[PDB]
Amino acid sequence: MIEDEMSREQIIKDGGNILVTAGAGSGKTTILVSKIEADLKENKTHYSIAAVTFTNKAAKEIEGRLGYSSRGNFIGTNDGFVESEIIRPFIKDAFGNDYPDNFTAEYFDNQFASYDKGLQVLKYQNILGTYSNPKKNFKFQLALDILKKSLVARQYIFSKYFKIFIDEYQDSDKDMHNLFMYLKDQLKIKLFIVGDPKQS
Amino acid sequence: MIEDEMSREQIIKDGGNILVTAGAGSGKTTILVSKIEADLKENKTHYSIAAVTFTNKAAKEIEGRLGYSSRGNFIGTNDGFVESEIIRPFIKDAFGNDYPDNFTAEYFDNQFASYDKGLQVLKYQNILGTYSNPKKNFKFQLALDILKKSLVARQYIFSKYFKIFIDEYQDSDKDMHNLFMYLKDQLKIKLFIVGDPKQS
Amino acid sequence: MKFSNITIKNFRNFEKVNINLDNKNVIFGMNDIGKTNFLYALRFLLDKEIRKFGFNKSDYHKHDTSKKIEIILTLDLSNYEKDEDTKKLISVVKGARTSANADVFYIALESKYDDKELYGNIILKWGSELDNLIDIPGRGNINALDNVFKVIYINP
Amino acid sequence: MKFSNITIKNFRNFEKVNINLDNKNVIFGMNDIGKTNFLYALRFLLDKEIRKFGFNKSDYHKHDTSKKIEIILTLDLSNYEKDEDTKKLISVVKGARTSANADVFYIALESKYDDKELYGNIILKWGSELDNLIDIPGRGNINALDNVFKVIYINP
Ligand SMILES: Nc1ncnc2c1ncn2[C@@H]1O[C@H](COP(=O)(O)OP(=O)(O)OP(=O)(O)O)[C@@H](O)[C@H]1O
Ligand SMILES: Nc1ncnc2c1ncn2[C@@H]1O[C@H](COP(=O)(O)OP(=O)(O)OP(=O)(O)O)[C@@H](O)[C@H]1O
Ligand SMILES: [Mg+2]
Ligand SMILES: [Mg+2]
Known part of the structure; x- marks a missing residue:
């Protein structure tokens, strides 16, 4: 049945942590839709997935290929995943009752590169900026501090999702790698990573 | 029978503008809730009334004395009435979609005392401050400006609200008087003003 | 003030049917052609006792059960003065009217099938444009469409 | 994980009744004393087909019909590890839990009578503290409590 269906049988029947180092093109999207459909067919329980992309039209095409379901699965970007599932329900739980609940995501005006100063901007000015250096993220370090401080957020992430589908892993910082290793190692979540190494 | 029932027929069955020369307190709350329950008894159409107070203790005391009403009658403070009835449903229809919908009143940091720097910090920083002059109202001036600007806000408060019951008029600014005169002269809303004998 | 249009998509025997309306509408036709499925499209839109049971498999x-049931009603609203029913509509809506489009209104119904719970949930919307239809707000079993319209159904 | 308590206020033949529970509950008593009015308080809370009709005059x-019907149920949730039903509750709720009160949960029901439309609307709530119970989110005829509990009512 040659190497393509042999790699398909190796990538469907294995339910562990899968690291994919593919090339340019050659159908990452259709093998993602087939792996997501095989995982949703195989799981009988109440658990859920989080398809994470970098561009929202590809997640819109993935949701158009899949359809409508009532299992509460998340399809979207990384910024929408951190903004909906991490920061906004648990920002009052992690940093006390004096911190505000709602915020507007605007990282184009503030360029402060300090941690406690960024906490003072998100306390006082009620905006969510970013660091001046492009290798560091204020938002993903804030998500790491929310999952380090709060107990309810770890219980929600461990109860809700069983497999996080990450697309385009190569344009990611070390804070996203530390947050995904914190989600994989400490919370025992099976992680799915695709992407092509190098190739600009 | 006789002049007591004739005086009760005069002071209960009024339909126009009411201005009673009575002092502050001394049983004005009981005749105010009697006028409110007589106006709720005498009305059979789809219209609704409004009640404006200052403190939340008299607001929950009035809410304890009425109980439950299903006609959409609003009882609250002036800033909550302006925020939840004038500002929030009509800022997107008056000044475009660049201004945010949800907002919090945090005046403990910004002490800006001009209208132009106030509108550019609602444009940029998306927060509202307070004037250095304590006899000012930025929110009531904004409500008067977007009631002058929007057509559907005038259509909604002409279609819904019938009378406004005002408490504690002795400590008020001229901008609230200008906005209540703007509601009085054009959009045909009666006024119920209590006051003071002299000074106090 | 005045009904103008109804657009029925993916319902029981209507695939995409657009009907201009008025006040005092009289519908007629043959036997088994869809006269009383037109009136059930008005009962699912505007009456709560029909709408509380949802949609079945046979309502598609x-x-x-892979298409979306969409029933949209257009209201005219050109006479704000002298008509009490325009004030009855406008005093409940409060937040989806626009002053540039103040002489049209839309009340829409959407439904997508679940095919796990075996249930078609009905989501109602209004707006003043056909894009940006916000959801009708409601608490419990009661939304704000039931505060405006009362539907009397007569059948001997 | 475990049921703990139910507090029934201003219902049919219960003025203010607090009953400690567990899993595996058995109720007994005389005739015309209210055994079947205990089980309809669980049908109005946790089942949607009873809840969709509201309350009449005779349910007070x-x-x-001037008092508020309130039915509050308490869940234990002390065993997050080894139990799957704790994760089935926690994965739907998502924002009403607090780390100071992570091992208690409350599901409440309020109802106040209209006495113009002659109807009792039912508003459901959850939270982890008895003060600041937010409303259950929901779209259409479905809220998020229906994704957790399924009630099987057996009566010969
Ligand atoms: N889900 C469905 N899929 C396909 N066809 C359907 C569906 N539901 C109803 N129909 C069709 O719609 C018609 C229903 O008849 P209906 O009662 O609406 O007609 P009518 O014009 O009111 O009749 P009459 O004049 O005899 O009172 C039938 O032809 C039936 O086959
Ligand atoms: N709204 C109400 N207000 C006051 N009393 C009420 C109300 N509704 C029911 N009751 C009373 O509750 C009782 C209803 O009897 P019910 O059927 O609950 O008894 P039971 O214990 O289940 O009986 P059995 O064991 O014989 O089946 C009657 O005494 C009736 O008068
Ligand atoms: Mg017929
Ligand atoms: Mg019984």
């Missing part, structure tokens, strides 16, 4: 076009 | 204590 040719038993398909 | 001594036909008063």
Whole structure:
């Protein structure tokens, strides 16, 4: 049945942590839709997935290929995943009752590169900026501090999702790698990573 | 029978503008809730009334004395009435979609005392401050400006609200008087003003 | 003030049917052609006792349950003065009217089938444009469409 | 994980009744004393087909219809590890839990009578503290409590 269906049988029947180092093109999207459909067919329980992309039209095409379901699965970007599932329900739980609940995501005006100063901007000015250096993220370090401080957020992430589908892993910082290793190692979540190494 | 029932027929069955020369307190709350329950008894159409107070203790005391009403009658403070009835449903229809919908009143940091720097910090920083002059109202001036600007806000408060019951008029600014005169002269809303004998 | 249009998509025997309306509408036709499925499209839109049971498999076009049931009603609203019913509509809506489009209104119904719970949930919307239809707000069993319209159904 | 308590206020033949529970509950008593009015308080809370019709005049204590019907149920949730039903509750709720009160949960029901439209609307709530119970989110005819609990009512 040659190497393509042999790699398909190796990538469907294995339910562990899968690291994919593919090339340019050659159908990452259709093998993602087939792996997501095989995982949703195989799981009988109440658990859920989080398809994470970098561009929202590809997640819109993935949701158009899949359809409508009532299992509460998340399809979207990384910024929408951190903004909906991490920061906004648990920002009052992690940093006390004096911190505000709602915020507007605007990282184009503030360029402060300090941690406690960024906490003072998100306390006082009620905006969510970013660091001046492009290798560091204020938002993903804030998500790491929310999952380090709060107990309810770890219980929600461990109860809700069983497999996080990450697309385009190569344009990611070390804070996203530390947050995904914190989600994989400490919370025992099976992680799915695709992407092509190098190739600009 | 006789002049007591004739005086009760005069002071209960009024339909126009009411201005009673009575002092502050001394049983004005009981005749105010009697006028409110007589106006709720005498009305059979789809219209609704409004009640404006200052403190939340008299607001929950009035809410304890009425109980439950299903006609959409609003009882609250002036800033909550302006925020939840004038500002929030009509800022997107008056000044475009660049201004945010949800907002919090945090005046403990910004002490800006001009209208132009106030509108550019609602444009940029998306927060509202307070004037250095304590006899000012930025929110009531904004409500008067977007009631002058929007057509559907005038259509909604002409279609819904019938009378406004005002408490504690002795400590008020001229901008609230200008906005209540703007509601009085054009959009045909009666006024119920209590006051003071002299000074106090 | 005045009804103007109804657009029925993917319902029981209507695939995409647009009907201009008025006040005092009289519908007629043959036997088994869809006269009382037109009136059930008005009962599912505007009456709560029909709408509280949801949609079945047989409420979809040719038993398909992969299309979206969409029933949109257009109101005219050109006479704000002298008509009490325009004030009755405008005093409940409060937040989806626009002053540039103040002489049209839309009340829409959407439904997508679940095919796990075996249930078609009905989501109602209004707006003043056909894009940006916000959801009708409601608490419990009661939304704000039931505060405006009362539907009397007569059948001997 | 475990049921703990139910507090029934201003219902049919219960004025203010607090009952400690567990899993595997058995109720007994005389005739015309209210055993079947205990089980309809669980049908109005946790089942949607009873909840969709609201409350009548006869569901209130001594036909008063000026008191508020309130039914509050308490869940234990002390065993997050080894139990799957704790994760089935926690994965739907997502924002009403607090780390100071992570091992208690409350599901409440309020109802106040209209006495113009002659109807009792039912508003459900959850939280982890008895003060600041937010409303259950929901779209259409479905809220998020229906994704957790399924009630099987057996009566010969
Ligand atoms: N889900 C469905 N899929 C396909 N066809 C359907 C569906 N539901 C109803 N129909 C069709 O719609 C018609 C229903 O008849 P209906 O009662 O609406 O007609 P009518 O014009 O009111 O009749 P009459 O004049 O005899 O009172 C039938 O032809 C039936 O086959
Ligand atoms: N709204 C109400 N207000 C006051 N009393 C009420 C109300 N509704 C019911 N009751 C009373 O509750 C009782 C209803 O009896 P019910 O059927 O609950 O008894 P039971 O214990 O289940 O009986 P059995 O064991 O014989 O089946 C009657 O005494 C009736 O008068
Ligand atoms: Mg017919
Ligand atoms: Mg019984």
